[model samples]
Each structure stands twice: as C-alpha cells, then as structure tokens.
Target: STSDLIPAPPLSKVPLQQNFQDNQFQGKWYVVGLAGNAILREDKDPQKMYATIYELKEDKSYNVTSVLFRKKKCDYWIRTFVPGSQPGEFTLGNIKSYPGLTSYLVRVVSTNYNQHAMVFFKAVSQNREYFAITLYGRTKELTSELKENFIRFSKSLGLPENHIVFPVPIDQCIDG
Candidate 1:
C-alpha cells in the first residue's frame, strides 16, 4: 500500500538532539540536490532550486525561503525553533501562512557546522510522509562526496530509490 511505503517510526524513538540550536543555523543554504518522490519528480526546472535559513530576532520568529530554481523568486514561510529532547534536535514549526499546518514540520537532520541536511515532513492522512530532503551547503555547487552522502542517507530511510533523481547540469528536470 502507498501508506506502507511512507511509515512513521514511533515518535518516542524518533531521534531528537540539540546540535542545531542557537544561531548556528542562520544562513543561506543552496539546494544542491533533493530526495523524495514528489520533489525529485516535481522540481525539474533548475529555476526552482533553492533553500535558505534565517534566524529569529528578539521578536521570536524566523523565515525560510525555498525557491523553485530562481533564487530571487521563492516562497517564504515563518518558523520557530525550540529546544528538543536531546542535543542537535529541535522542535521547529511554520508560524506563517498556515500555522496550523504542523504535520508539515522541518528538521535539521545532519550538519557539520558549515553544511547541513534539512528534511521537511507533512502528514498524509495521519501518516507521516517524507515530503522533501534538501541537501544544502554554503555555496550553490556541492562536492560529489556530499551529494553521495545525501543519497545514502535518504536510502537509509527506506525511501524509493527508483524515485530518486539527480539534478541536470543544464537546469532542466523531469516533470511528472
């Protein structure tokens, strides 16, 4: 069943750490590559490739802009990050637009101070679906090693490998 393909582990078992707290995540992260059925197939145009992270000021809010391909033209969302169960783990949620839309959660999956992986999740009929995986870096281009690492991590989650698509250098994509 399609629901079986996208499973959500026990919430208690879900790994939550404190490694992504503070202003460490404040910066622009170019979407070098992405994983998941929807994004791999839908985001084919190079102009639709971009991601960014902004820190919240004393006002207690943050903003995220994910572009389709043109960096200047992107969709913006508001969010807030709070301490989670463990190190590197944070409880982040969208505060703008559809604030009630929580199943659409964002998490900083992996990071190395300079680079990181941001995974977005949305609940489909009460089932947690792996919506998008954005592998980001300080620059627009990424090393082969980083790209491979992202693929491997997504695979580890048991996502459909056949659905995984690579970015075309010419800035074209396979639309569904």
Candidate 2:
C-alpha cells in the first residue's frame, strides 16, 4: 500500500531556525532525489541522467540550471523569493503574472549550517494536482546512513516511501 504524501507541518508550527535568506542561499547544489508523478520517468534512466542546482543572488533573484546526460548543455530559468515579514510564509516567483507561467514554491524544511532539506511544489492546475516531498542535502550521492536519515525525515512528514524516487549515480553506467 502506498503511504499518504502530506505537506510539512507549517513553518510556524515547527521550531525551525532561519539559516539562508536573500544571497545566503546562493551556492551550487548537486541534484539529489526527486518525487511526484509529474516528474519525468526518464530521469531514472542511467544513460539519460540529469543534474540541477540553483543560486540565489543579492538582488533577490535566482538562477537555476539543469544538465542532462553527458551533455554540458543546461536549461535555465530565473525567479525570485521573499521571506515573510513575520514567519511561516514565503512568497516566491512573479512567474505567474508576467509570463503567466506557474512556478515552483520551495520551502526550507530543516537544516544545519552544513546541510538541509527542502520541499518543492507547483501550484494546482486543471490537468494536474500538486505533489511535493522533502529533498536532503546538496549532493546527489547519499551514504547509507544519510539515506536512512532522509527516509525517516520524509516518513515523519507523511510522504509515502513509494512516492520517493532515489537517484542512481551515473557512475554505475560505465563499463570496465
């Protein structure tokens, strides 16, 4: 049976401390894992792998690039985020109004200075319902210990194990 996927407890309800805001989140992060049915199943293919990372700039804007396979080419996008004046709410992207495109909403679920977990969800549409889950750390590679911890965290948030798709390393494809 599949477990129910639920949103993280509201930021207001959790005891989370703010770490990155504005330019602080600007850095390179390797693609870790992705969830939801809308995601491309081709993403699971070893020969056709993809990697993504994003950088937030001092101007409150963000840039994201994703590369697939051995190809150095990447798809790019720009967006912005504003922290709530109080807490628990974050306003992300004017993509909806300008280009009239629905953009993703990212939330910081948990973190220390070294690592953190995030959740991404797109707004609802007539053809698609919103789906979301937690992503841990910046690196795509996860040690067994870290993997277990991530599982625990996700389960605690009510995300089903089946909904989670762990990314296989591209190194596995090379033949000796």
Candidate 3:
C-alpha cells in the first residue's frame, strides 16, 4: 500500500550545533569520511578524497571552495553556503546547473572548532530526498575516537556500513 516515491526523514530530529561561529570553522578542512544512503558502491578501488576551504563573507554567508582530483587533473569547484534560520544551518546556493536539484540543505552537527567537524546534508532531486554525512578534520588523518564517532553518528542516521567510506587521501589538489 506504499507509493513508489521514497520519502526522506524530517530534519526535526537531526542534531545541529548551537550558536555556530563561522570564524572558528574557517580555513581548510580535509574530507576524512562520508556516509550516505545513495552513495555509489560496488567499486573495486577506493574513492579519492580532496579538501575544502571555507571563507566566510561579511554577510554571514560562506564561499566554499574544493578541488577534485580525477584522472591526474584537478577539478576546482565552488559553492555558496547561505545562512539559514540559525547558525550552523545552511543551504547550498549558486547551483543552477545541477539538473533536477531543488534544494540542498546542510547542518553542522558537531565540531570542536579546532580538530574535527561533522556535517549533515539533505538534497532533494526530482522529488526524492537524499541524505549524506561528512566528517572533516584539520589534517588528512583523524583520531580513532573521531572515526568511531563518525560511524556511530552515521549508523544513527540509518546509513549502513557498506555506504560509509573513508576515501584514499590524495596529495594533489590539496592546497590552492
């Protein structure tokens, strides 16, 4: 008796950081791990990871820049993080090219403002919602406790172990 459309959970239960300060979150963050419900799986080789820089604007928005290392080339990408009703909540904007994408919501779930941070994202594409969680660190490597925390948080979000990944670190495209 269920429809074909798969529905996503509401954000009411999603944890978010209170009074998030963008200043502390500025600088480069390495992509340490990722968990998602619809991420690509069954690949023989591990995925390549990159880095992102957060530049806060005067208007409280953020200019997020990232470089993707693919096939010995660097693919630079930039997106704007529009502040939401509260701090630590944002919506990815300036993405008019992604066909069928309606919304991209992000939330900073946890952060120490120094070593590690965890972010959650919800994107609606063609009426279907997709959820993903990302773990970021100040360095390319993370502590064991942080990794465990990421796995626990991801499991709480209903993402299985198969969908969680810590990509291979790539030296190229890490710095500007």
Candidate 4:
C-alpha cells in the first residue's frame, strides 16, 4: 500500500521551503519520513533508517554526506551542495556519483530547526523519475505530534497517506 502512495510524474509544480537559511540547515539530520518514487524510497524497508550530514563552507555551499542502508549496500554520499541567492535551495546531480541525474532542484518546505524538517524535490531521466517528499529530524526519533505534522504536510502536497513511509530510524547499517 505504501508503494501505491507514491505515484509517478509528480505534480507539475512543487513548492520550496521559505526562510531556510543554510547556516541553520547545516548539521546532521535523520530521515524520518519519505514519500514518492525517489532514490531513497527504493531502499525503503518500512522499518529502515537513513541520515545525512551537511557541512557548510565559507563559500555558502555545503559538504553533504548522506548515509543510506539497504540489503544491497550501505550507501554514503559525499557531495557539494551549491545554493543560490535564495535560501533553502540547492542543485545536485549530473556529477560522477550520479551522472544520470540532471538539474535536480532541492527545496526545503518546512523545518523547526530543533525537531523536524520537510523537503520536496523532483528529477527525471528517460527511464526513471525521482520525486520525493522527505522529512528530516534533528535526532533519531520524532515525537508523535511531529510525525503527524509531517503526514498532514505531505497530504497537503497531494501525496496520499499510503505513499508516505515513516521509517523506524534503526541505523541498522551502522553495524552492517
């Protein structure tokens, strides 16, 4: 059922988060909720866990490292995130790590700084399409209310409840 929640060809226009300062966004984040047919979604185990770390530099970009765990691989991504004059906006893809991805636009939809964050983005290739509504938290676990907030926020964006998976945050790959 969760698989059906994330359909293909995401909405024509996706909105970005406002006032998402890179300075504040720079830190470690745990992936709490993920929706849509995204690269992160494929590894979804319903009980799986994921995380990322953002290191800001003087140039206003971030050195981002993403940690993802699946039965196939424990993936780690160390990439540079370049922001524009606008905040909470960055572009990645078409690089050596993901040469298939092009013009990937990352937008922060909402965040509380200390507790949780919601981000939306989309990317596509001839054979595949990546669209996601990802929720991040400062720590490994989120409060019940915080999880509900993410669901409501995702529903508002047109993704059904079944499509969104609230991962268990196990960090199982740490040992694997």
Candidate 5:
C-alpha cells in the first residue's frame, strides 16, 4: 500500500546534523541519489537527475534553486527555505500552490558541509503524504560509502528496494 509506504517519523525522532552551520552548507550540491515512498518511486518514468544550490541570506533564510532536465528541456525551480526552531530544520516557504497542502518539512539528516549531505523531506497534503530522501554531493561523483548510506537510510524508512535509485546524470541545466 502506498499509504503504508509513505511513513515519516516525527521530526524529533530523526537525527540531525550536530552544530549545523548554515554558512558551511551554502553552496552547490549535486543530487546524486534519491529514494521516495510514492511518486518518485512509483512513476515508471522518473525525473531526470538534477542539482540544487543553496544560498544563505542575512536573515537566516535560504534561496534554494533547483536545476533539472525535464521533458527533454532544461528547467529551473526557485524556492524559499525558511529556518525552523531546530538548527538543521527548515520548511519551504511558498507551498501554497500545492493543492490541499497541509505541511512540508525539510531537514538535514547528516552532512559534513564539504563532501556529502543527506536530506529528508516529508510533504503532507489533504489526502496523502510523500516522503523523499536525497543524497547530495559536492561533486557529481560521490563515494560508495555515501551511496550505501543513502540506501541504508532509505530502507530504514521502509521504502522498497526498487524505490531507491541513483539516476543517471543529465548534462543539461546543471549550471542553471
């Protein structure tokens, strides 16, 4: 059941980066791996590989830019990241466009702020919830340990093995 697969523990239960520093984490991150409970996993044709850029602002907010290739074309998605009470927690600021969106939670699960980062996201709408786990790297090529870590973490979240994927990189829109 998709609902059964769409499980996310409370934020308090998820481990976070210790003494997280926003400045150190601000930079370009290549989306190297991804796992999800619903759409990202269930869709027969998955989204193209992408990259994300994080820019910290004076008010502790972040400007997040997503660069991706979709439908054989390049696309850029810009969103606002508002800081949360917890050090490594954040939520997308402008999600009103999503129909019946109840909540969107974002957290930095683990990171060194130099090489790799593991991020967790849960978006709950009126009807259902979706869970996504992303592995980002300073470079497109990440170490095997980082890859394995993402797989292990996703499995712990109850995602099936087929739900996890390290998508092939798309040459377009990466630097947008």
Candidate 6:
C-alpha cells in the first residue's frame, strides 16, 4: 500500500520570511507540531517533538543537526543548507535524490525569535506536490496561541483541518 497522501495545493511560488536575520536564527529549534501539507503525506511516523540545531561556520558553510527519537533510539543527521540569494530561503541541494525537473524550496513564514516560527516546505512533483508546513519553537512545547495560529493558517491554505497533527506528550521524545 502507498503511504503517500494527496498533497497540499501546489503554490505558484515559494514565499519566504521577511526581515529575517541569520545571527538570531542560528540555534536550536524544536519541532513542536507538524501540519503536513495535507495534499501530500509521508514523513509522519513516531508522533513526538524533535529538534534541529543550526551551527554556524566561519568558512562558507553552516551545519544543521536534526535529532529524532523513535523506538528508544536517538536518530540524528546533519547537513549544510546551501544559501539562497535571500534570507530565510534555502536550497537543500543534493543530499537526496530526485528526478529531473524537480525543485526544492524551504522558507520561513513567521517567528517571534523565541516562541514559535512557521516554516513552509515546497517540493513539486510531476504528478503531485510533496511538502510540509512545520511549527518550530525554542523548546519542546508550544504555547496554545502558537498552535491555534498555525492551525488557522493551515486551514486558510485549503487543507483539511482534520489532518492537523496536534502533538501529544511522548516520553521517548525527551530522554535520549
């Protein structure tokens, strides 16, 4: 059976975050909630919070370390995000395989520096669109305000509200 859900509506273009800074954004961001671009689904697995750490480098590169806990094992991976011409936009080039004419666009939507930031990910496929809009926070938990706003924003994009992945506390999500 195919695990792929439909996919969120294909955006004409990937819009990015405005007034974003590199210095302030370089740190750890916890993945609090995942509103899967309902049009497409696949990345959903162990339901819990995870984190991504951004480590800046002096020479032409920066490192992104993502920590995921599933089945009593702490899974993590690191990669360097290739810069785009503007802030809050990146081209995560070549770490994964894709067919011809495929493009990946990752952008930030909004944030308040500490609490939460909405992220938009768009990768268009020939037949469908596979993407996710993730909510990130400074810690493992998110304020109710943040969660409400993210859900409303997602609904406005024509996604089914039922698909929203509201988080439930998981013991494995915290301890390594």
Candidate 3's TM-score reads 0.90
- Index of the highest-TM-score prediction: 3
Preferred candidate (lDDT higher): 4 or 5: 5
What would the TM-score be for candidate 1 when compared with the true structure?
Answer: 0.64
Across 1-176, the per-residue lDDT of candidate 6 in tens digits comes to 34556456555433567887767778888777777654333355536667778776775345878887766798778767776667787776574565643766677878777667888876666655667788888777777888888888777666676666755555563434
Lowest summed lDDT across 10 adjacent residues in model 2 is found at 167-176
User: Could you give candidate 3's per-residue lDDT for residues 1-176 as a string of tens digits?
Assistant: 33343245568767999878889999899999988877655579788888889999999899999877988899888989999878899987776878888989999999998899999989988877788888998888998989998999888777778888997787888865
lDDT of 1 at 75: 45
Runs in model 5 lying further than 4 Å from the true structure? 1-5, 39-47
Backbone clashes (count) for model 4: 2
Which sections of candidate 4 miss by over 4 Å?
1-15, 38-47, 72-74, 93-97, 127-129, 171-176
lDDT against the true structure, per candidate, is 0.53, 0.49, 0.84, 0.71, 0.83, 0.70
TM-score of each: 0.64, 0.61, 0.90, 0.76, 0.88, 0.77
Residue 73 shift from truth in candidate 4, angstroms: 6.7
Ranking of candidates on TM-score, top first: 3, 5, 6, 4, 1, 2
Instruction: Locate the minimum summed-lDDT window of 10 residues in model 5.
Output: 1-10
**Which residue pairs clash in candidate 2?**
none
Best by lDDT: 3
TM-score of 4: 0.76
lDDT of 5 by residue, 8-110 (tens): 6666656788898999999999998988876455466766679999999999999999888887787788988899878888988877876788888889999
Supply the global lDDT for candidate 6.
0.70
